[PDB]
Design goal:
- Homotetramer.
- One of its GO terms (molecular function) is nucleoside diphosphate kinase activity.
- One of its GO terms (cellular component) is cytoplasm.
- It catalyses: a 2'-deoxyribonucleoside 5'-diphosphate + ATP = a 2'-deoxyribonucleoside 5'-triphosphate + ADP; a ribonucleoside 5'-diphosphate + ATP = a ribonucleoside 5'-triphosphate + ADP.
- By secondary structure, the chain is an alpha+beta fold.
- 40% of the residues lie in helices and 16% in strands.
- It is built from eight helices and four strands.
- A four-stranded antiparallel β-sheet has the order 2-3-1-4.
- The protein is globular, with a radius of gyration of 15 Å.
- The chain starts with a strand and ends with a helix.
- The chain binds uridine-5'-diphosphate and magnesium ion.
């Protein structure tokens, strides 16, 4: 089943919103399958945000993502990548739909609560970067039969 990489950013961690954010992910039907609180090493931050390497918001992104712990997640469900993006909302929390995580909780683009892989491609890449296979569990859940056909 489709998987995506989600990460609760240091802003959410320092605002004490880890439970609130997990709740919104869980209640949507997405299954938490990998989850860990971690300090982000430099090596991992730079390679994770490799694609932004030249841009104005770069140096800041790196020191921000390394400034306090994150909660890194692997999440499973039909159409998980796009479903997660939908409940996360637009990059800019001012454009993000009310009721989305960023729409309800965040204020500025640089401090937008949570990251979600933007594609199947980057999901696979991000998952492998942050997690080893043995940290990722598989398990059937009682509600699985009521989420899908
Ligand atoms: O103008 C911008 C665009 C992005 N970002 C930061 O860089 C991250 C990656 O941006 P992107 O639009 O590629 O992905 P998204 O955050 O929407 O998943 C964002 O989460 C922002 O925190 C920023 O600070 N300023
Ligand atoms: Mg986005």
């Amino acid at each position: 089943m489709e998987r995506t990489f989600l990460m609760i950013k240091p802003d959410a961690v320092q605002r004490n919103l880890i439970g609130e954010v997990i709740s919104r992910i869980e209640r949507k039907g997405l299954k938490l399958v990998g989850g860990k609180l971690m300090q982000v090493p430099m090596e991992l931050a730079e390679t994770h945000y490799g694609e932004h390497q030249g841009k104005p918001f770069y140096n800041d992104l790196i020191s921000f993502i390394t400034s306090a712990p994150v909660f890194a997640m692997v999440v499973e469900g039909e159409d998980a990548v796009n479903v997660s993006r939908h409940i996360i909302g637009s990059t800019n929390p001012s454009e993000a739909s009310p009721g989305s995580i960023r729409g309800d909780l965040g204020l500025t683009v640089g401090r937008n609560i949570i990251h979600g892989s933007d594609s199947l491609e980057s999901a696979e890449r991000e998952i492998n970067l942050w997690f080893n296979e043995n940290e990722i569990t598989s398990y059937a859940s009682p509600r699985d039969a009521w989420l899908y056909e």
